[PDB]
Design a protein around this ligand. Structure first.
Ligand SMILES: O=C(O)[C@H]1CC[C@H](C(=O)N2CC[C@@]3(S(=O)(=O)c4ccc(F)cc4)c4ccc(C(F)(C(F)(F)F)C(F)(F)F)cc4CC[C@@H]23)CC1
Length: 253
């Protein structure tokens, strides 16, 4: 099942599907690395209330997950799976896909990230009262930056993050397994061709992405307990769905 030419076609289809669905262009992100938030603007973010910061960030996370949903829909084999499985995959892998994609908006020279139009370090998010979570996200982004990923590599890697046959609650496990294998062949074939099989040992352990997503759900339950109405009234429906039937509607478009 799937010859040499079919693997090279899958490689190119995955690389195309990814370029079409990344929220921010790498060119644009790079042509902005100098637009850094001033000490005053940073103090402004630091002084904003916890609920204000949480709402802005949940809104930003929602926009990203939305482009990730569009990646999955454009991804070969995904829309052929049943609705239950498509939802199991996104509910579990969307956040993880955003966690990989965020390395493109990160600068390892000055340890900053792109946020609301400019770059700023960890201290920008002090008002969230996360600390450990913000550190973890920054460390994760730092470790992926070390890998010097090409766009095709993030494409192939993120497709595999999402197409996970081990996700609890899969109705047609074999059908996901076949797709994951094809995507594994494609990824490794591309790594082999480009002489980049080196990164294989250096890719993050599968439990690291799980740890980050878990910390997110734990820091949210803490916030939701202190500001329940802020979450019901000002948090996005799709965010509440994944982390607290938008998916069924987004997938049917
Ligand atoms: O091109 C693309 O598709 C990319 C472009 C970059 C995008 C991106 O970096 N991101 C999407 C939004 C953003 S961010 O830019 O707002 C950001 C926030 C905190 C950071 F430390 C670093 C970046 C985000 C938003 C909220 C959370 C939270 F988990 C938490 F707690 F950390 F704040 C939560 F609030 F939701 F809980 C995490 C993240 C990490 C990935 C970041 C992802 C999509």
């Amino acid at each position: 099942m799937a010859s040499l030419t079919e693997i090279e076609h899958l490689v190119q289809s995955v690389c195309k599907s990814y370029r079409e669905t990344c929220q921010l262009r790498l060119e644009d992100l790079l042509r902005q690395r100098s637009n850094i938030f001033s000490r005053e603007e940073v103090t402004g973010y630091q002084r904003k209330s916890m609920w204000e910061m949480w709402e802005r960030c949940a809104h930003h996370l929602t926009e990203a997950i939305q482009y990730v949903v569009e990646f999955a829909k454009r991804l070969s084999g995904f829309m052929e799976l049943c609705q239950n499985d498509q939802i199991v995959l996104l509910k579990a892998g969307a956040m993880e896909v955003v966690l990989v994609r965020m390395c493109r908006a990160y600068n390892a020279d000055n340890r900053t990230v792109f946020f609301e139009g400019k770059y700023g370090g960890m201290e920008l998010f002090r008002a969230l009262g996360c600390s450990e979570l913000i550190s973890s996200i920054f460390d994760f982004s730092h470790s992926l930056s070390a890998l010097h990923f090409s766009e095709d590599e993030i494409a192939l890697y993120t497709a595999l993050v999402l197409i996970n046959a081990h996700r609890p609650g899969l109705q047609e496990k074999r059908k996901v397994e076949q797709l994951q294998y094809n995507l594994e062949l494609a990824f490794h074939h591309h790594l082999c061709k480009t002489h980049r099989q080196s990164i294989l040992a250096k890719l993050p352990p599968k439990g690291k992405l799980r740890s980050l997503c878990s910390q997110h759900v734990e820091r949210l339950q803490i916030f939701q307990h202190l500001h329940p109405i802020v979450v019901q009234a000002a948090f996005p429906p799709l965010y509440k769905e994944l982390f607290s039937k938008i998916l069924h509607r987004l997938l049917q478009e």
